[PDB]
Write a protein that binds this ligand. Structure first.
Ligand code: MYA
Length: 411
């Protein structure tokens, strides 16, 4: 069934993954010296290219490839339009490796054909809580704890082949060359997400949406008007009313995050994430990079009363092109990022996220059912969407976990 994935170090079936009881590698140990020094071979008319994703013109070339060829729905209504500023932020965190950003171009004229990107992350990925209990019952705690230490791995994102080059087996070549470059840096696992089902996820969650501008969402056919609203004289008036929000935040002391908040925000975030089976470990530099506000890109607010930061939330912006509507160009979506609540209930924290995003001109707030996101779905009027985000590892055996045990947000 899978001419490429059957040759890779991943679990091959659901039934195999149901059988895994400890975290650890799939492949034999290898060394940097074992890995080919030269790029993987590619057709003579193509050439490998490493963009510099801090230089404006190279970022722009990658932006146009994704604008015109990245994720779109099956009805070709919406396609992601990540901004140039977003790509520089996502691709260049502290200690990033320029070599892990991999492109193919046509040699003759330099037309960009394909891309894939890796960034470093430190991830807790040892055996999950429920399987460590089973290990204790059986006298197998030592094997279950062998890989408990956080590991420096690769996160992969932005895999993209040009629409004129689809179904020619170019994606497997991109993945093999990414893998080589990563392994030449002595890193042997990766984490990735996809909306498609491949061999084999360790966790899967539904998407959720919260309408912020329901008249626009119905106009572009992102949303429809639900049937019972037809019992009203003015269905759209009642829909608007149902989703209305306050014009200003409700929590006293909410303000934008600043550099001096970095240590207190790292503390409350890490104490919270530690309770989940799979999650990141962030330094002060990575908390600054992923959470300090950047215009058009990442928005982060803290609750400070009486001089102490007790809570915070963040969201990020990804617009999508509206392909078929002749009245709107873009869908402006806000995605729930990291958060931590110590002084107020989580629903009260996240209502101010929705108030801020609406005030700033967003049309919808989206998220997946990771972290404690299920805890405010009903009260804050989110609804489940179509399909699911699946979490995968490369070269790591891992027991199936629930999405509410996943604390890693993928951009
Ligand atoms: C240690 C370091 C490890 C580093 C690497 C870790 C692994 C990283 C893995 C990547 C994680 C990326 C995370 C993200 O970015 S998910 C975002 C993916 N991008 C999009 O959906 C953008 C629009 N679509 C495209 O650009 C293409 O259709 C892509 C590029 C997706 C496939 O191009 P194309 O349609 O022209 O097909 P092909 O003939 O070249 O190749 C077909 C083979 O590709 C397999 N395929 C299809 N979709 C995906 C998918 N989303 N992940 C993994 N594999 C996928 C498929 O099962 C088949 O294999 P097999 O079934 O025959 O065996």
């Amino acid at each position: 069934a899978h001419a490429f994935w059957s040759t890779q170090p991943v679990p091959q079936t659901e039934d195999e993954t149901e059988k895994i009881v400890f975290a650890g590698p799939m492949d034999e140990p290898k060394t940097v010296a074992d890995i080919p020094e030269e790029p993987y071979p590619i057709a003579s008319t193509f050439e490998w290219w490493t963009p510099n994703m801090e230089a404006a013109d190279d970022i722009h070339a990658i932006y146009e490839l994704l604008r015109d060829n990245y994720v779109e729905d099956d009805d070709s209504m919406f396609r992601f339009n990540y901004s140039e500023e977003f790509l520089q932020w996502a691709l260049c965190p502290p200690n990033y490796i320029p070599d892990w950003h991999v492109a193919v171009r046509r040699k003759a004229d330099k037309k960009l054909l394909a891309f894939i990107a890796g960034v470093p992350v430190t991830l807790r990925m040892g055996t999950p809580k429920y399987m460590k209990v089973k290990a204790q019952e059986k006298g197998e705690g030592e094997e279950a704890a062998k890989y408990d230490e956080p590991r420096h791995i690769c996160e992969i994102n932005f895999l993209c082949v040009h629409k004129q080059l689809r179904e020619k087996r170019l994606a497997p070549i991109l993945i093999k060359e990414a893998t080589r470059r990563v392994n030449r840096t002595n890193v042997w696992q990766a984490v990735y997400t996809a909306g498609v089902l491949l061999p084999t996820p360790y966790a899967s969650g539904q998407y959720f949406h919260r309408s912020l501008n329901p008249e626009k969402l119905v106009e572009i056919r992102f949303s429809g008007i639900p049937a019972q609203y037809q019992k009203f004289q003015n269905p759209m008036a009642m829909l608007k009313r149902n989703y209305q929000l306050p014009s200003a935040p409700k929590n006293s002391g909410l303000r934008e995050m600043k550099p001096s908040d970095v240590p207190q925000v790292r503390r409350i975030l890490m104490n919270y994430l530690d309770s989940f089976d799979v999650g990141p470990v962030f330094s002060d530099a990575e908390i600054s990079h992923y959470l300090l506000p950047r215009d058009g890109v990442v928005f982060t607010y803290v609750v400070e009363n009486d001089k102490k930061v007790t809570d915070f939330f963040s969201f990020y912006r990804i617009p999508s092109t509206v392909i078929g509507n002749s009245n709107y160009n873009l869908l402006n979506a806000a995605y729930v990022h990291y958060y931590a609540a110590t002084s107020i209930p989580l629903h009260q924290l996240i209502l101010d996220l929705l108030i801020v995003a609406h005030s700033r001109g967003f049309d919808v707030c989206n998220m997946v059912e990771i972290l404690d996101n299920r805890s405010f779905v009903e009260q804050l009027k989110f609804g489940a969407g179509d399909g699911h985000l699946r979490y995968y590892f490369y070269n790591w055996a891992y027991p199936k976990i629930k999405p509410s045990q996943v604390a890693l947000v993928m951009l």
